[PDB]
Amino acid sequence: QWEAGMSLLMALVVLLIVAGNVLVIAAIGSTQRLQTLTNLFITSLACADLVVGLLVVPFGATLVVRGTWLWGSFLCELWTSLDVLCVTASIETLCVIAIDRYLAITSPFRYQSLMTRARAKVIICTVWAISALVSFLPIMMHWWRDEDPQALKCYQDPGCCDFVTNRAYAIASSIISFYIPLLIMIFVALRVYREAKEQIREHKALKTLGIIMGVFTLCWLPFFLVNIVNVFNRDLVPDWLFVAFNWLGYANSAMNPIIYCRSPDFRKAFKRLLAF
């Protein structure tokens, strides 16, 4: 009945993630004072955290509690597709956020005229399409599959939902969905910092964004590191820690609304909807 306490903490995180990110989306929707361009990209980020609290983690919980997949081969693949799309769309969006800031800070005039809200939406949409293209389709086209006896065994057990991939796909996709967008964000972000210094409230906002980014990297990097190591030497790091780290990635989805508590704005808008 260890199953019962697990369904309690699990149910609890789903609550954090879902409540916190609905609060964000609603606060920004409420105040137009809170409606800036930056916050448009933040909403995009919130939505990807929502999908996780609503779809990814719920089914993911059953998998960890029962050590087996109850939902069938098709939903297994679908679930996996969704999981990957959400992490790709996050880091891709954090990228945009950084580059957006770096442009506003260096080219303030050429920035205001070119950058409206209709375009940020067009940009958000393009990140989700790019994210769908590089991480949803391939999984749904079955390119991730291995040829190994053990792999084929898994693909035929509706109870097995191990993301057992071929090594080509393991490298290509971690680089393409995570590493590249990560490097880019790290670089562009560093630059924004130097610029902000060569300029010394706006900074508190810039710092919050850096924190959002830094926590993202800490929460997900262990998993993508372990991912590559595995490609080289399959039995050098224990399956359970593989799972531990992926859950650290999932938990990130609840840290954002928490971090936004640094703001007076977000602090006075968080308490208007919770009724105080």
Ligand X SMILES: CCCCCCCCS[C@@H]1O[C@H](CO)[C@@H](O)[C@H](O)[C@H]1O
Size of the site for Na ion (CB under 5 A): 2
Please check if 246 is assigned to a binding site.
yes
For the segment 90-109, give every residue that binds Na ion (CB under 5 A): none
Per CB under 6 A, the list member of 20, 138, 249, 257 interacting with ligand P32 is 249
Q: How far apart, in whole angstroms, are the C-alpha atoms of residue 57 and residue 217? A: 19
Strand partners, 165: 145
Q: Which of the listed partners (Na ion, ligand X, a second copy, none) does 160 bind, with a CB threshold of 5 to 8 Å by partner kind?
A: Na ion
Q: Is 180 in the site for ligand CCCCCCCCCC (CB under 6 A)?
A: yes
**What number of residues does the chain have?**
276
Site string for a second copy, 175-194 (x = CB under 8 A): -x---x---x----------
Per CB under 6 A, the list member of 181, 210, 249, 257 interacting with ligand CCCCCCCCCC is 181
Smallest separation, CB 64 to ligand X (Å): 21
- Tell me whether residue 78 or residue 248 sits nearer to ligand X (CB atom): 78
Strand partners, 145: 165
Please check if 157 is assigned to a binding site.
no
Give Cα 142 to chain centroid, integer Å: 23
All residues at 6 or more sequence positions from 28 whose CB lies less than 8 Å from its CB, including other chains:
34, 35, 39, 40, 42, 43
Residue 259, exposed/middle/buried by CB under 10 A (0-12, 13-18, 19+)?
middle
Please check if 83 is assigned to a binding site.
yes
Residue 46 per-residue DSSP state? H
For the segment 19-48, give every residue that binds ligand P32 (CB under 6 A): none
Per CB under 8 A, the list member of 7, 107, 112, 126 interacting with a second copy is 126
Q: Is 252 in the site for ligand P32 (CB under 6 A)?
A: no
Window contacting ligand P32 (CB under 6 A); options: 24-32, 97-105, 116-124, 162-170? 162-170
- Tell me whether residue 71 or residue 111 sits nearer to Na ion (CB atom): 71
Q: Report the SS3 class of residue 165.
A: strand
Size of the site for a second copy (CB under 8 A): 19
All residues at 6 or more sequence positions from 79 whose CB lies less than 8 Å from its CB, including other chains:
55, 56, 59, 60, 71, 161
Q: How far apart, in whole angstroms, are the C-alpha atoms of residue 96 and residue 179? A: 15
Q: Is 160 in the site for Na ion (CB under 5 A)?
A: yes
Residues forming the annotated binding site? 83, 173, 246
